[PDB]
Symmetry: C2
Subunit: 284 residues, 2 copies
């Protein structure tokens, strides 16, 4: 009858750094409303809910923000992989498959110091709309920037599941960005869900919830697209490990490991720490 959730940090080499995450390792008793309600209870930027089946290395997953369900490849999957490794045991590399509605994601995990290192294969990035010149300018100003604050590389919608409008801006512009306009209908025109501000030279990014109020520490769902973008436009090497940076404006500077293969496939990885195990005391 025991049901649990776990508090983890992802993209974290020590506890109480990186991006906090709640993981429910067996959410079989919860309906969708309960999953959304528990996500709001725990107040982590995302919670992930695992549904076991007949394969001990494969789980269905459901990912929620405090706003909505996001059934797309992201860093909650890294945290889930680490937790599954903790629960199974074994000193060797472990392989996992997590099923989201839209796709299957292959992951691997290894033990690393006090915690784990986990990596996922997000597949090849899909490059979508290119905003026209007037639209690029509008998005800059929606974040309190000007058209000159944009870089010399094209804003584009890039996706490994959840489409981001990647908006290349200068390092200077990134530090003073503030969302002041509603982005919903502008993003709708471009087939994009969220904006990710990107310093391509410093390989650093910033992104928020839809209202621009809560900033995400480290966004695995954007890390893939960003990596694929940098490689596509000759700003990073194919087949080599590099790092993206996120979270320093929240005093939680984090490192996201990324790589684009010859196939196109982008892999995203990071360290994971386990912080707490919680037993549910309410009715199932």
């Amino acid at each position: 009858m025991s049901r649990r959730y776990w508090q983890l940090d992802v993209f974290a080499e020590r506890p109480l750094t990186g991006n906090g995450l709640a993981v429910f390792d067996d959410a079989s008793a919860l309906d969708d409303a309960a999953m959304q309600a528990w996500t709001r209870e725990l107040r982590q930027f995302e919670s992930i809910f695992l549904l076991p089946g007949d394969d001990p290395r494969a789980f269905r997953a459901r990912i929620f923000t405090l706003e909505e369900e996001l059934p797309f490849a992201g860093h909650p999957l890294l945290g889930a992989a680490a937790l599954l490794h903790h629960l199974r045991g074994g000193d060797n590399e472990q392989h996992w498959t997590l099923h989201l509605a839209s796709k299957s994601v292959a992951l691997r995990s290894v033990r690393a110091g006090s915690g784990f290192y986990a990596e996922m294969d997000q597949g090849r990035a899909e490059f979508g709309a290119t905003p026209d010149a007037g639209t690029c300018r509008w998005f800059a100003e929606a974040f309190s920037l000007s058209a000159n604050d944009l870089s010399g590389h094209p804003p584009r919608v890039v996706s490994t599941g959840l489409p981001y409008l990647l908006l290349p801006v200068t390092a200077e512009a990134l530090g003073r960005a503030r969302q002041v306009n509603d982005l919903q209908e502008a993003l709708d025109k471009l087939g994009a869900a969220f904006v990710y501000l990107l310093d391509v030279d410093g390989r650093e990014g910033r992104t928020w919830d839809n209202l621009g109020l809560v900033e995400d520490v480290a966004t695995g769902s954007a890390a893939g697209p960003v990596a694929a973008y940098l490689v596509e436009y000759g700003l990073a090497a194919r087949g080599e490990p590099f790092v993206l940076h996120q979270g320093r404006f929240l005093e939680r500077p984090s490192r996201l490991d990324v790589q684009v293969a010859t196939d196109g496939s982008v892999r995203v990885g990071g360290h994971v720490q386990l912080l707490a195990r919680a037993e549910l005391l309410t009715s199932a």
Copy 2:
């Protein structure tokens, strides 16, 4: 390694009301560690208890993600319910929770679901009465117009933590959004935070100082609000009544209040106990 608990305060059922983490024995946690765990868990407030001189007396430390807030509020109700859970006992249990120089009297009882807990916030203190220009400025700082003020005079009111209570209509309350920095203006009035108040609906909204995260149910404001309503003849002295908060986060909360005729403002509600958490790191 140690222990904390997840509870909901002012919650008629689990997964609504104001979520709260309670560390029942924080004797070996330094202030930096308390603040760090508060930021990790992301509950609007976390509370840390340390044994008093007495099995019913505890010292308490309350943190938001920004700062320590050593004032009687929702976390004390959660702490009292948890202490009742841990100690056992049949009837009403009494507790004294110390917040710096304040000794706050709490009572708890078992309920069919969870607990009921109440606190005595003492006598409310009334303060500044901002002029019309200043009231309009505050309305505008929340994306509201002068016409959205309901006509009941804004006042600074406190049971420890002073709030500017800003009476607005229900229509206005539901489209409020902070768009200006409030610190200079609040400092001038001797207030720490703004609480937007629909006096007729007995519903309010309030945020952190930057207007980014909304609080579900603000126990430290509930006493001042009850006192205000009684002062201005919108509720009767001595009669218990109910305030509402949390609807805008899909977490409706019921806050029981009474301005007793002998002066004491009481604030209470149901408290749910959701989880027991064990730390896996030191």
